[PDB]
Design an enzyme around this catalytic site. Sequence first.
Site, short mmCIF file in Angstrom:
data_model
loop_
_atom_site.label_atom_id
_atom_site.label_comp_id
_atom_site.label_asym_id
_atom_site.label_seq_id
_atom_site.Cartn_x
_atom_site.Cartn_y
_atom_site.Cartn_z
N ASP A 160 -0.83 -8.29 3.32
CA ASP A 160 -1.56 -7.98 2.06
C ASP A 160 -3.22 -8.00 1.79
O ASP A 160 -3.66 -9.21 2.08
CB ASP A 160 -1.10 -8.97 0.82
CG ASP A 160 -1.43 -8.85 -0.65
OD1 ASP A 160 -1.72 -7.65 -0.76
OD2 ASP A 160 -1.27 -9.62 -1.29
N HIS A 161 -3.68 -7.08 1.45
CA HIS A 161 -5.24 -7.03 1.17
C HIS A 161 -5.90 -7.26 2.52
O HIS A 161 -6.94 -7.62 2.43
CB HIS A 161 -5.81 -7.89 0.04
CG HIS A 161 -5.36 -7.67 -1.19
ND1 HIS A 161 -4.21 -8.07 -1.80
CD2 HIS A 161 -6.14 -6.99 -2.06
CE1 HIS A 161 -4.18 -7.49 -2.85
NE2 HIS A 161 -5.17 -7.06 -3.30
N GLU A 269 0.11 0.99 1.53
CA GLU A 269 -0.37 0.79 0.22
C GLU A 269 -2.02 0.65 0.05
O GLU A 269 -2.48 -0.09 0.77
CB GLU A 269 0.30 -0.50 -0.66
CG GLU A 269 -0.66 -1.06 -1.51
CD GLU A 269 0.00 -1.96 -2.55
OE1 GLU A 269 -0.44 -3.17 -2.72
OE2 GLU A 269 1.26 -1.72 -2.92
N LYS A 311 -4.45 -14.48 -12.40
CA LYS A 311 -3.34 -15.21 -11.73
C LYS A 311 -2.91 -16.04 -12.73
O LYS A 311 -3.55 -17.01 -13.52
CB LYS A 311 -3.85 -15.79 -10.46
CG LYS A 311 -3.92 -14.97 -9.13
CD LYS A 311 -4.47 -13.95 -9.01
CE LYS A 311 -3.94 -13.20 -8.06
NZ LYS A 311 -4.93 -12.21 -7.25
N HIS A 343 -0.91 -5.48 -8.97
CA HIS A 343 -1.49 -6.77 -8.35
C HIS A 343 -1.29 -7.62 -9.32
O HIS A 343 -1.41 -7.31 -10.59
CB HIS A 343 -2.49 -6.31 -7.43
CG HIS A 343 -2.56 -5.41 -6.45
ND1 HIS A 343 -3.36 -5.26 -5.25
CD2 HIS A 343 -1.17 -5.05 -5.83
CE1 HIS A 343 -3.00 -4.46 -4.43
NE2 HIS A 343 -1.53 -4.31 -4.74
#
Length: 490
Positions: A160-161, A269, A311, A343
Amino acid sequence: SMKAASIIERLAAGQVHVYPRSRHESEGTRVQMIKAEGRKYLVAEGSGKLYDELRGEEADGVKLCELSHENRLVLNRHFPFTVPQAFGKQSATIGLGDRLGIAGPGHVQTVRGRAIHPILAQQSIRELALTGRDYKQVIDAAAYAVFQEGYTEGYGADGDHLKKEEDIRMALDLGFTMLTLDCSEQIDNEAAQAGESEVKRKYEELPESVRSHYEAKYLDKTFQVGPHAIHFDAATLMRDVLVYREAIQFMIYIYEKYIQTAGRAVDFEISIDETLAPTAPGSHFLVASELIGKNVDIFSMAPRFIGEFQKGIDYIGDIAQFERELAVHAAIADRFGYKLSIHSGSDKFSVFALVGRYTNGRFHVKTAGTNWLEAVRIVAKTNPGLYRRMHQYALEHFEEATAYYHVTTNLNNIRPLADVSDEELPSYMNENDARQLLHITYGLLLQAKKDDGSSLFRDEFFRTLSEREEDYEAALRSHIGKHLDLLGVK
């Protein structure tokens, strides 16, 4: 090591917990998962290469195995459904990140019988750093969880990222099936805010060939996407090129160097929601057009939606406006073939129906810290003393963690620990600000140590979770099931 002997005594006696969906077989070897409470192990009877290749101390016909990386690699060789796999863009997926490595089984139990493919192994470099874990541990927990629950329809593993090549190559070598390119270092945010005429200033410093490309292909053209048309004035085309061009070359260089050459299906992605501006639809269209013009195989695109995706909490902004922007984004993804990826998707309940509708169920939604927050909820119901100590610890180090995640948390909204009883402690994890206070401080709480050496909270936390595992798992099913229902899954 005496206990290995007694545990087997406790086993074939029958006062030891065996996970009921965990019996699998490879040739003559049968394998099971057991909890000899406090801890989890593999138990293998029978005879065959799987028994021989598992590592652990034996006793007559039985071998007791720790849930180690290498036993995971052995189970991988005998049990395919324990290997990460890719899913493609004509599918519904949910990224179920687990900062603790204990959320897997609850996650599997939630997606069992729902029309979604789970990405059980998903962590970013920062989360790894702030928790002291490696990517092997992330896949190990996900692989052991599907073996524990006898979930054979597949799971994926998402880097991820990632931004660095060394991390890209590393994730591939370890069998990751999904890669999320970050692209922040190359997004030109300066250009995204800069006024006009500064945008013309810098645009006209571009090579003649480049401007001739983007202008011969987009300038004063209109594109049908769905029922929506997208038209490129000179102003927006020039701002777009300036914001995204270097980010587009990076996506292409990564894809050709590492994705095309991987020699196995990889879900690619591209993340572009780390722009201070929302992602206009023309921006989205041009990026896609450029990538698909060079034959890049995108799994999903994460745009920056209007409003705020923070978040821990639900969406902030104008829902009707978000709807208008969502309708075009979903239509652009439909024209080009990849999915929209959301996200910070967790707890964003106000948008799930809209996302399910407009993507006709074909989407990626990423969660993570929620899951850690649900664990924190369990500690607050069954070990108030422990929760009070962390909540206060979180409060005192909160300034530190806001370097890492962007929250507009209002600490003045969190009732003081002294003013809430132990029974009320769980309710903190329904409140926007308290939820954000414990979300982003996970790294500080996990690493904190007594000033001799041992852990300040981490051992008690995992001890509490291990003994309340039935409640954590049921908390995950309830919290994550609510996401999938709102998404309209199954």
